[PDB]
């Protein structure tokens, strides 16, 4: 009765449990080439990727 519903992790698999700052990441993504949600994407909003980081949309790295 529990088939396919009760699974088990492989030996190498693991759950993430650490918590980090993730505050300097939005400022690094912009150095890398992302353009903030505020504007000037430099393309057409259709040739651009919507960047998300943990629910918060940094916004629109060029394609």
């Amino acid at each position: 009765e529990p088939c396919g519903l009760m699974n088990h992790l492989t030996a190498v698999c693991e759950v993430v449990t650490q918590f980090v700052y993730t505050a300097s990441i939005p400022a690094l993504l912009c150095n890398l080439g992302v353009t903030p949600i505020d504007g000037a994407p430099h393309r057409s909003y259709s040739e651009c990727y919507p960047v998300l980081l943990d629910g918060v949309m940094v916004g629109w790295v060029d394609k």
């Binding site: 912009c30 150095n31 890398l32 080439g33 353009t35 000037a40 430099h42």
Partner: protein
């Protein structure tokens, strides 16, 4: 003496900082592959018949 709109910019520059790619070496494993199980040298029979 106030601020007025000036001429439209003629171009835009977007700066980002980027490093480059190295050569493809693809060094897959320290001791690589699945090394095969194998024969211990000589071994010898560890059993004899009676008589």
């Amino acid at each position: 003496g106030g601020l007025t709109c000036a001429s439209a910019p003629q171009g835009t520059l977007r700066i980002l900082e980027g490093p480059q790619q190295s050569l493809s070496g693809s060094p897959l494993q320290p001791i690589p592959a699945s090394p095969p199980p194998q024969i211990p040298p000589g071994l010898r029979p560890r059993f004899c018949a009676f008589g």
